[PDB]
């Protein structure tokens, strides 16, 4: 029934327009009715007005009224105090916008452009929730949760989109909600959609996998190598039980909130003949879900084909969601289910479900307990304990490799990039091994001679003792300034900083020409380094080079982190560089926008290198990916590579020998200064590079240790003595 008047809700509008506007002129329903009495206005041409009309309480954005705002005061509407807040926030707004940097001003302009479009998008209905039929067409708007669902008389919505909405209204009356082997592997792409022809061969085989698995009654772990097979082949497989067989039970898909918009957009584009109760929002929104869309026909005759819920909400309403005999439970990013102590794992186990599918974006290499948990969730039977499993999982056996990740009947696809991609050019890992700069040599000598007293222990040393030294020396594989920064009084002079950069960093001499060559071509660059402080040097270096760039590390807040990634991933992205980190590989980010990447640093785990490559090896890439790794003939990573290749920092004797073999002889020899081994700048390294798919007193020139022991005993003695006996 009706209610009383006189309340404001919210102020999100600001405009300039001709006087005398009434109703909802710029809204689509009023545009059809009156066009616009403000049409043809210009800010200065006519005596108009700077409006900021208001979103009104008890009425939707489709009912957003535009009037002479003098009428607002003329009606004594409650809630005018928000109007005063609007000016003060707006007055602060221009004081920042008019003085910020033009890049940030245009950034805020893009933020406004996203903003009002999001505001404009609120107007569009999504569904009416079926004296007029389902009286007054209780309906949802785009963006708002179900709490904001409201009514219409059929006088403005009936014109705008009820023509197609009635077809969805008619869908309400439409009737909705083990066999032998089936004639699979036909060409059903006609069922895909109104342009449903884009299914590739491997995606079709994945559907053929899923159907075969249910024909055997088995369950599935969708272990696709983080390709496109996350969503497209998953939603299409549910068509097997509905649009071919009409065996349409209730389907659950629990997807994370970050990916929910994608899942909800592709459940309509593909499998369009489906309904989807998005189970989001506050308690009111879910109450509206239950009373009005959960069971349209009668008691327990569910009318939802699929419902999307976050993992966060599934734990809150575990009772209502778990009371139904599910035909299908789907979980996206399923590496969250790697632990049996997880509450989601424990509660999702107890859900009675006919079929179960897990989607993961990792090779799930982790130890037996992670696999045991995942196998238990998809199949609760015949995999219950180690006692009945030890004969098969018992590792340490070469004959056991015939079963380890081979003999698994609850099949995982594990279908790698190398199987699906068939037109990518060959790849070679470029290793730019080179001599050491003079400054690096001196600092490398500085570190080694400092730690002689620890190195003398040899086999009786400490593993943590060496690791600190090796971690310290790795700062010499990186550039010097991690050890001791340059003098500020000279470094600040850009008239000399260019000479400082080029003389200190031989590593850039070949890259300089590649940078110019590919900037003319339009390429983009991603850079990886472990040391966050070393990344800081790159940010300062890039700010001096003035190339546009972004950064990605764990110290960045979520909103800025997501926008930085989206800025580089947007169509026609202009940013040139990206300070990346290995830990970002678990976020599912896309690297296909940049075809050139530099591996500046080195890492002790090849899995991190694989994670960096996996996000760049996107299926469908036509160009040859450009990759470069830097080696400086010191802190020898090749000592690991020659051993790692038989199976792809572990043994105390080995690690001591690495220091005794790495830089074995080219210490501070009497050869003197100004050696400067630069003479391989260009076209030497390009042609000659290979490609593929003693105790310390005997070693170290002990003369320097006199020169350090007799000087450190001076540095750390004045620092004691240089303070007065008395105050003042």
């Amino acid at each position: 029934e009706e209610e009383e008047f006189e309340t404001i809700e919210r102020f999100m509008d600001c405009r300039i327009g001709r006087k005398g506007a009434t109703g909802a002129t710029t809204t689509i329903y009023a545009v059809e009715a009156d066009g616009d009495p403000n049409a043809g206005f210009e800010k200065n041409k006519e005596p108009g007005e700077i409006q900021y009309l208001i979103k009104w309480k008890g009425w939707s954005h489709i009912h957003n009224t535009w009037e002479t705002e003098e009428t607002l005061k003329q009606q004594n509407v409650r809630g005018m105090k928000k109007l005063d807040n609007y000016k003060k926030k707006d007055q602060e707004t221009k004081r920042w916008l008019k003085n910020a940097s033009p890049e940030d001003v245009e950034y805020y302009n893009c933020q406004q452009e996203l903003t009002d479009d999001l505001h404009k998008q609120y107007q569009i209905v999504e569904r009416i929730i079926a004296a007029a039929g389902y009286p007054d067409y209780y309906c949802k708007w785009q963006g708002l949760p179900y709490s904001e669902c409201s009514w219409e008389d059929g006088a403005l919505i009936s014109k705008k989109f009820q023509a197609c909405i009635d077809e969805y209204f008619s869908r309400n009356q439409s009737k909705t909600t083990r066999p032998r082997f089936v004639a699979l592997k036909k060409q059903p792409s006609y069922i895909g959609g109104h342009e449903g022809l884009e299914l590739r061969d491997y995606q079709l085989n994945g559907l053929n996998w899923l159907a075969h698995s249910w024909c055997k009654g088995n369950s599935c772990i969708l272990a696709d190598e983080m390709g496109l097979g996350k969503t497209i082949q998953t939603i299409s497989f549910l068509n097997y039980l509905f649009h071919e067989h009409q065996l349409y039970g209730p389907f659950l898909l629990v997807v994370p909130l970050s990916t929910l918009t994608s899942w909800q957009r592709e459940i309509q584009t593909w499998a369009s003949q489906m309904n989807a109760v998005v189970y989001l929002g506050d308690i009111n929104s879910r109450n509206m879900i239950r009373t009005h869309e959960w069971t349209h026909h009668q008691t327990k005759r569910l009318k939802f084909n699929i419902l999307l819920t976050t993992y966060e909400i599934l734990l809150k309403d575990k009772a209502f969601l778990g009371g139904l005999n599910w035909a299908f439970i789907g979980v996206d990013e399923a590496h969250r289910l790697k632990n049996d102590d997880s509450l989601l794992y424990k509660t999702l186990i107890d859900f009675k479900s006919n079929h179960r599918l897990l989607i993961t974006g990792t090779p799930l290499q982790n130890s037996l307990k992670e696999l045991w948990s995942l196998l238990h969730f998809i199949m609760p039977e015949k995999f219950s304990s180690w006692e009945d499993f030890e004969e098969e999982h018992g590792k340490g056996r070469e004959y056991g490799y015939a079963s380890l990740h081979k003999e698994l009947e609850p099949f995982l696809l594990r279908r790698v990039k190398k199987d699906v991609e068939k037109s990518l050019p060959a790849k070679v890992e470029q290793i730019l091994r080179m001599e050491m700069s003079a400054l690096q040599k001196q600092y490398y000598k500085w570190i080694l001679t400092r730690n002689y007293k620890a190195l003398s222990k040899g086999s009786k040393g400490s593993t943590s003792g060496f690791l600190n030294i090796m971690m310290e020396l790795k700062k010499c594989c990186n550039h010097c300034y991690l050890i001791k920064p340059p003098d500020n009084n000279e470094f600040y002079n850009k008239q000399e900083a260019l000479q400082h950069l080029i003389r200190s960093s031989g590593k850039l001499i070949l890259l300089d020409k590649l940078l110019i060559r590919l900037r003319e071509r339009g390429n983009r660059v991603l850079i990886f380094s472990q040391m966050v402080r070393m990344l800081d040097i790159l940010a300062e270096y890039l700010k001096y080079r003035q190339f546009p760039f972004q950064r990605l590390d764990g110290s960045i807040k979520g909103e800025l982190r997501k926008q930085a990634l989206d800025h580089f991933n947007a169509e026609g992205s202009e940013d040139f560089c990206f300070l990346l980190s290995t830990r970002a590989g678990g976020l599912g980010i896309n690297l296909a926008s940049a075809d050139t990447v530099v591996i500046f640093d080195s890492d002790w785990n090849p899995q991190n290198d694989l994670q960096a490559q996996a996000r760049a090896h996107r299926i469908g890439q036509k160009k040859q990916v450009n990759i470069y790794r830097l080696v400086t003939k010191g802190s020898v990573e090749e000592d690991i590579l020659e051993r790692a290749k038989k199976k792809m920092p572990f043994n105390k004797e080995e690690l001591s020998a690495i220091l005794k073999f790495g830089a074995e002889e080219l210490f501070k020899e009497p050869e003197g200064e100004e050696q400067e081994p630069q003479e391989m700048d260009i076209d030497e390294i390009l042609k000659r590079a290979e490609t593929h798919e003693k105790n310390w007193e005997e070693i170290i020139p002990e003369d320097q240790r006199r020169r350090l022991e007799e000087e450190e005993r001076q540095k750390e003695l004045e620092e004691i003595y240089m303070l007065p006996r008395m105050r003042n």
């Binding site: 009706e2 009425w59 009912h63 009224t65 007054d136 009514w151 219409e152 008389d153 006088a155 403005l156």
Partner: peptide
Amino acid sequence: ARTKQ
């Protein structure tokens, strides 16, 4: 009618 006239 519910709408604003």
